[PDB]
Design a protein around this ligand. Structure first.
Ligand SMILES: *[C@@H]1O[C@H](CO)[C@@H](O[C@@H]2O[C@H](CO)[C@@H](O)[C@H](O)[C@H]2NC(C)=O)[C@H](O)[C@H]1NC(C)=O
Lengths: 47, 43
């Protein structure tokens, strides 16, 4: 399971930044499992 | 070959470095320089 990562500062409001930016590898976990679906996790706000 | 101090910058995930012809040029950092060789002619 390979994760490649990159971070960038952008100054738009609501868009997909254009241009080119290569992503360097972050980790290569030797797990070896069957994966067919995935879901993202986000944090909500309460007060 | 000959191990030489390398001015090239290698990323942390990079181990080997290959130039044109897909041959080994640098190994984790030391540059590989094949030692002196050539032809010999007799006059
Ligand atoms: C990973 O699991 C999925 C189950 O969701 C497998 O998909 C099924 O595989 C069987 C064979 O074992 C087929 O008969 C089904 O038709 C498949 N269903 C779907 C919806 O694709 C998938 O084969 C598994 N992958 C691995 C590498 O084990």
């Amino acid at each position: 399971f390979k994760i490649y990562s990159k971070h960038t500062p952008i100054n738009l409001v609501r868009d997909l930044p254009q241009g080119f930016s290569a992503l360097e590898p972050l980790v290569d976990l030797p797990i070896g499992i069957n994966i067919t679906r995935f879901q993202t996790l986000l944090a909500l706000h309460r007060s | 070959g000959v191990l030489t101090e390398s001015n090239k910058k290698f990323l942390p995930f990079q181990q080997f470095g290959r130039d044109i012809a897909d041959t080994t040029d640098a190994v984790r950092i030391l540059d590989i320089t094949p030692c002196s060789f050539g032809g010999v002619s007799v006059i």
